[PDB]
Design a protein around this ligand. Structure first.
Ligand SMILES: Nc1ncnc2c1ncn2[C@@H]1O[C@H](COP(=O)(O)OP(=O)(O)OC[C@H]2O[C@H](O)[C@H](O)[C@@H]2O)[C@@H](O)[C@H]1O
Length: 192
């Protein structure tokens, strides 16, 4: 895990790091899920495998959690399903907060931005509600959902800036590949 940037946004310490989110030292990590919480690939698969030892098992656990937390088999942008991090608890990660970003498919609009904005703010508000002090996020929608990485990072930063809370003290954005981390770093530098 390599930290590439650190700054304060109010009382929150914000970090950009390059690495695997399942190894980040945060109490909650966020999953870039689909609305059905079927963890087929990308960071959802990585998280599901790291937590349960089998992604399929974590998918079932997630669906059960969603059914009881929401009373249905899908979530809307901004809604957050919470599941225990299981095997990751030994490294201090207690929860996975599943969020669902929009499917951009190479496009960008205010409607897509608003959906992604909700997908980033929702987990921050859930952390606040639960009294969770540290949370880490992946670049929601920047993978197979095809949202431009720069736009994803700018949207994440807007959510962190607008968030109001007292319990959340540390937020991190964890980027996986080297090329992408460089793009994110430039966004952090020009935004702050
Ligand atoms: N271990 C990891 N740690 C941090 N980031 C990662 C990791 N693995 C991948 N990424 C980055 O995570 C970012 C997000 O890529 P994506 O995981 O496709 O998510 P989406 O929101 O676009 O697609 C959601 C759908 O994909 C799944 O199949 C779900 O079940 C959904 O069906 C990229 O920058 C990756 O390089």
């Amino acid at each position: 895990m390599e930290v590439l940037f650190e700054a304060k946004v109010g009382d929150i310490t914000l970090k950009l790091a390059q690495g695997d989110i399942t190894q980040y030292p945060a109490k909650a990590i966020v999953n870039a899920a689909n609305k059905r919480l079927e963890h087929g690939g990308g960071v959802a698969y990585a998280i599901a495998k790291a937590c349960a030892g089998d992604a399929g098992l974590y998918t079932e656990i997630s669906k059960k959690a969603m059914r009881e937390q929401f009373g249905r088999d899908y979530i809307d942008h901004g809604e957050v399903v919470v599941t225990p991090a299981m095997n990751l608890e030994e490294r201090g990660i207690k929860y996975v907060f599943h969020t669902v970003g929009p499917i951009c498919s190479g496009m960008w609009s205010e409607e897509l931005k608003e959906k992604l904005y909700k997908a980033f703010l929702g987990p921050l508000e859930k952390a606040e509600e639960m009294g969770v002090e540290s949370i880490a996020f992946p670049a929601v929608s920047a993978g197979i959902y095809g949202c431009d990485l720069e736009k994803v990072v700018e949207t994440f930063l807007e959510a962190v800036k607008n968030f109001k809370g007292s319990a959340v003290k540390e937020v991190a954005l964890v980027i996986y590949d080297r090329k992408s981390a460089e793009v994110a770093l430039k966004v952090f530098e020009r935004s702050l």
